[PDB]
Design an enzyme around this catalytic site. Sequence first.
Site, mmCIF file in Angstrom:
data_model
loop_
_atom_site.group_PDB
_atom_site.id
_atom_site.type_symbol
_atom_site.label_atom_id
_atom_site.label_comp_id
_atom_site.label_asym_id
_atom_site.label_seq_id
_atom_site.Cartn_x
_atom_site.Cartn_y
_atom_site.Cartn_z
ATOM 1 N N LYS A 81 12.630 -21.637 65.927
ATOM 2 C CA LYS A 81 13.667 -20.890 65.070
ATOM 3 C C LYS A 81 14.758 -20.343 66.141
ATOM 4 N N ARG B 248 17.167 -23.388 66.759
ATOM 5 C CA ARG B 248 17.987 -23.778 65.680
ATOM 6 C C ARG B 248 19.221 -22.529 65.438
ATOM 7 N N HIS C 297 20.456 -20.281 67.556
ATOM 8 C CA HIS C 297 21.007 -19.736 68.978
ATOM 9 C C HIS C 297 21.466 -20.801 69.884
ATOM 10 N N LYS D 296 23.841 -40.520 57.146
ATOM 11 C CA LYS D 296 24.430 -41.367 56.391
ATOM 12 C C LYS D 296 25.430 -41.725 57.306
ATOM 13 N N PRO D 297 25.703 -43.110 57.369
ATOM 14 C CA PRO D 297 26.343 -44.066 58.227
ATOM 15 C C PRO D 297 28.166 -43.571 57.931
ATOM 16 N N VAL D 298 28.572 -43.830 56.937
ATOM 17 C CA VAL D 298 29.862 -43.327 56.706
ATOM 18 C C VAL D 298 30.268 -42.431 55.667
ATOM 19 N N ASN D 299 31.406 -41.579 55.772
ATOM 20 C CA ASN D 299 31.518 -40.479 54.558
ATOM 21 C C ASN D 299 32.816 -40.144 54.986
ATOM 22 N N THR D 300 33.845 -40.134 54.085
ATOM 23 C CA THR D 300 35.097 -39.466 54.068
ATOM 24 C C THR D 300 35.263 -38.117 53.502
ATOM 25 N N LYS E 262 33.808 -51.448 44.354
ATOM 26 C CA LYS E 262 33.254 -52.642 45.249
ATOM 27 C C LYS E 262 31.685 -53.255 44.809
ATOM 28 N N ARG F 134 32.345 -41.498 60.814
ATOM 29 C CA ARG F 134 31.384 -42.990 61.204
ATOM 30 C C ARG F 134 30.458 -42.773 62.340
ATOM 31 N N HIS G 181 32.528 -40.508 42.988
ATOM 32 C CA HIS G 181 32.146 -41.311 44.050
ATOM 33 C C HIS G 181 33.096 -41.549 44.704
ATOM 34 N N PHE G 182 33.122 -41.949 46.021
ATOM 35 C CA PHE G 182 34.053 -42.293 46.935
ATOM 36 C C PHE G 182 33.857 -43.909 47.212
ATOM 37 N N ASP G 183 34.922 -44.592 46.786
ATOM 38 C CA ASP G 183 34.627 -45.937 46.860
ATOM 39 C C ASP G 183 35.175 -46.690 48.192
HETATM 40 N N1 LIG Z 1 35.237 -45.267 53.596
HETATM 41 C C1 LIG Z 1 34.135 -44.805 53.039
HETATM 42 C C2 LIG Z 1 33.213 -45.776 52.703
HETATM 43 C C3 LIG Z 1 31.888 -45.536 52.092
HETATM 44 N N2 LIG Z 1 31.788 -43.697 51.708
HETATM 45 C C4 LIG Z 1 30.593 -43.302 51.309
HETATM 46 C C5 LIG Z 1 30.703 -42.537 49.950
HETATM 47 C C6 LIG Z 1 29.577 -43.383 49.060
HETATM 48 O O1 LIG Z 1 28.891 -42.002 48.843
HETATM 49 P P1 LIG Z 1 28.978 -41.305 47.302
HETATM 50 O O2 LIG Z 1 30.486 -41.056 47.186
HETATM 51 O O3 LIG Z 1 28.008 -40.124 47.331
HETATM 52 O O4 LIG Z 1 28.187 -42.509 46.461
HETATM 53 C C7 LIG Z 1 27.012 -42.233 45.875
HETATM 54 C C8 LIG Z 1 26.507 -43.281 45.032
HETATM 55 O O5 LIG Z 1 27.230 -43.422 43.869
HETATM 56 C C9 LIG Z 1 26.798 -44.761 43.101
HETATM 57 N N3 LIG Z 1 28.152 -45.278 42.549
HETATM 58 C C10 LIG Z 1 28.808 -46.465 42.911
HETATM 59 N N4 LIG Z 1 29.763 -46.926 42.252
HETATM 60 C C11 LIG Z 1 29.769 -45.752 41.227
HETATM 61 C C12 LIG Z 1 30.495 -45.478 39.965
HETATM 62 N N5 LIG Z 1 31.442 -46.292 39.618
HETATM 63 N N6 LIG Z 1 30.342 -44.347 39.224
HETATM 64 C C13 LIG Z 1 29.390 -43.537 39.656
HETATM 65 N N7 LIG Z 1 28.605 -43.796 40.723
HETATM 66 C C14 LIG Z 1 28.737 -44.829 41.460
HETATM 67 C C15 LIG Z 1 26.327 -45.644 44.389
HETATM 68 C C16 LIG Z 1 26.633 -44.849 45.608
HETATM 69 O O6 LIG Z 1 25.653 -45.053 46.675
HETATM 70 C C17 LIG Z 1 28.699 -44.088 50.447
HETATM 71 C C18 LIG Z 1 28.106 -45.235 49.834
HETATM 72 O O7 LIG Z 1 28.920 -46.181 49.260
HETATM 73 O O8 LIG Z 1 29.664 -44.220 51.478
HETATM 74 C C19 LIG Z 1 32.999 -43.056 52.192
HETATM 75 O O9 LIG Z 1 32.594 -41.697 52.090
HETATM 76 N N8 LIG Z 1 33.929 -43.404 52.791
HETATM 77 N N1 LIG Z 2 25.166 -10.038 69.657
HETATM 78 C C1 LIG Z 2 24.340 -10.429 68.508
HETATM 79 C C2 LIG Z 2 23.796 -9.247 67.739
HETATM 80 C C3 LIG Z 2 22.973 -9.759 66.959
HETATM 81 N N2 LIG Z 2 22.508 -11.152 66.588
HETATM 82 C C4 LIG Z 2 21.457 -11.726 65.797
HETATM 83 C C5 LIG Z 2 20.152 -12.268 66.315
HETATM 84 C C6 LIG Z 2 19.269 -11.925 65.276
HETATM 85 O O1 LIG Z 2 18.527 -12.771 64.697
HETATM 86 P P1 LIG Z 2 17.124 -13.354 65.538
HETATM 87 O O2 LIG Z 2 18.028 -14.054 66.563
HETATM 88 O O3 LIG Z 2 16.419 -14.040 64.594
HETATM 89 O O4 LIG Z 2 16.510 -12.037 66.076
HETATM 90 C C7 LIG Z 2 16.067 -11.088 65.222
HETATM 91 C C8 LIG Z 2 14.858 -11.255 64.479
HETATM 92 O O5 LIG Z 2 14.053 -11.822 65.638
HETATM 93 C C9 LIG Z 2 12.803 -10.724 65.405
HETATM 94 N N3 LIG Z 2 12.654 -9.951 66.631
HETATM 95 C C10 LIG Z 2 13.062 -8.884 66.495
HETATM 96 N N4 LIG Z 2 13.133 -8.310 67.623
HETATM 97 C C11 LIG Z 2 12.174 -9.002 68.259
HETATM 98 C C12 LIG Z 2 11.050 -8.943 69.620
HETATM 99 N N5 LIG Z 2 11.302 -7.677 70.298
HETATM 100 N N6 LIG Z 2 10.223 -9.844 69.684
HETATM 101 C C13 LIG Z 2 10.132 -10.783 68.979
HETATM 102 N N7 LIG Z 2 10.754 -11.002 68.030
HETATM 103 C C14 LIG Z 2 11.657 -10.183 67.552
HETATM 104 C C15 LIG Z 2 12.622 -10.225 63.867
HETATM 105 C C16 LIG Z 2 14.195 -9.714 63.918
HETATM 106 O O6 LIG Z 2 14.603 -9.793 62.683
HETATM 107 C C17 LIG Z 2 19.922 -10.949 64.095
HETATM 108 C C18 LIG Z 2 19.493 -10.000 63.400
HETATM 109 O O7 LIG Z 2 19.137 -8.824 64.532
HETATM 110 O O8 LIG Z 2 21.279 -10.691 64.822
HETATM 111 C C19 LIG Z 2 23.139 -12.102 67.689
HETATM 112 O O9 LIG Z 2 22.902 -13.081 67.468
HETATM 113 N N8 LIG Z 2 23.980 -11.589 68.543
#
Ligand SMILES: Nc1ccn([C@H]2C[C@H](OP(=O)(O)OC[C@H]3O[C@@H](n4cnc5c(N)ncnc54)C[C@@H]3O)[C@@H](CO)O2)c(=O)n1
Ligand SMILES: Nc1ccn([C@H]2C[C@H](OP(=O)(O)OC[C@H]3O[C@@H](n4cnc5c(N)ncnc54)C[C@@H]3O)[C@@H](CO)O2)c(=O)n1
Lengths: 124, 124
Positions: free
Chosen positions: A7, A10, A12, A41-45, A66, A85, A119-121
């Site tokens: 945690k 993740r 800090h 996801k390989p490509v996304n705009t 397409k 990409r 959908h983005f094509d």
């Molecule tokens: N330059 C590029 C190239 C690709 N891409 C992305 C966007 C697509 O995601 P998304 O828009 O969520 O699409 C979600 C899904 O929707 C489906 N779909 C395809 N054609 C559709 C249509 N006409 N209407 C509704 N859903 C469609 C299949 C697709 O996997 C993904 C796969 O093509 O790649 C991009 O962001 N930029």
């Molecule tokens: N400048 C600052 C000031 C604050 N903060 C953040 C971090 C704290 O989150 P976290 O890292 O999970 O830590 C807090 C949590 O961890 C646990 N915890 C608290 N005191 C502990 C101790 N002495 N030993 C072990 N776990 C403890 C429970 C508590 O809710 C949050 C709340 O205090 O504020 C910061 O990132 N930067």
Amino acid sequence: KESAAAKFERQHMDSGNSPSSSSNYCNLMMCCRKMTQGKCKPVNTFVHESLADVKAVCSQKKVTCKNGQTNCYQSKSTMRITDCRETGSSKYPNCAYKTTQVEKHIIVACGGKPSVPVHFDASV
Amino acid sequence: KESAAAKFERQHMDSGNSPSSSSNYCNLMMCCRKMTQGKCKPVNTFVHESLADVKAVCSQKKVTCKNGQTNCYQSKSTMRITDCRETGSSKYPNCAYKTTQVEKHIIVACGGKPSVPVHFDASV
Ligand SMILES: Nc1ccn([C@H]2C[C@H](OP(=O)(O)OC[C@H]3O[C@@H](n4cnc5c(N)ncnc54)C[C@@H]3O)[C@@H](CO)O2)c(=O)n1
Ligand SMILES: Nc1ccn([C@H]2C[C@H](OP(=O)(O)OC[C@H]3O[C@@H](n4cnc5c(N)ncnc54)C[C@@H]3O)[C@@H](CO)O2)c(=O)n1
């Protein structure tokens, strides 16, 4: 249960020289946006345009998807997008992406009612 | 079951966020590291030093934790960390963090056998 040690890692640890580097954009977004769970996801705009402008594409130029489906549309104008990409080095659960910013036309499939992007094509 | 429209926004939309921005780190990292689910984690520090250097803090300067517990240790040297704190305009589920790059001594609680870091206490 997630161990206390795991945690701590993740919540800090992010070892490295340039953690806030923009070349990390995709790595962080792909993770945040939940596209690195189970597999890497390989490509996304990511589109950096107003949601109003992206929805408008659904009433713009019609094109074949397409995969043969016929519900695709191409943007009349270019849009600022980020291409994420997977690198050759990327290996789940350690997914790595190359971040590339470009201005290209996008192609999306639209569905539902009202008709919206589901959908983005491709980018051209 | 997430809607197709919602799935498209999550996977492809990033309106009003520049990929070339260092200030965005905390927002993406807090999201990627699962600290914005259920509610926004108020404060959280990310450490950029090696895992080995952080683990070694458990064998350094013994200090008292903020909560009165006695298993806290302070680093002998300053470490490169990123301080993430909610902004005033932060409102769940729209968590917003201010990113501040700092160099300070960290204080961690250690536990387990071997004794490893299990909680971040403070930076000083
Ligand atoms: N330059 C590029 C190239 C690709 N891409 C992305 C966007 C697509 O995601 P998304 O828009 O969520 O699409 C979600 C899904 O929707 C489906 N779909 C395809 N054609 C559709 C249509 N006409 N209407 C509704 N859903 C469609 C299949 C697709 O996997 C993904 C796969 O093509 O790649 C991009 O962001 N930029
Ligand atoms: N400048 C600052 C000031 C604050 N903060 C953040 C971090 C704290 O989150 P976290 O890292 O999970 O830590 C807090 C949590 O961890 C646990 N915890 C608290 N005191 C502990 C101790 N002495 N030993 C072990 N776990 C403890 C429970 C508590 O809710 C949050 C709340 O205090 O504020 C910061 O990132 N930067």
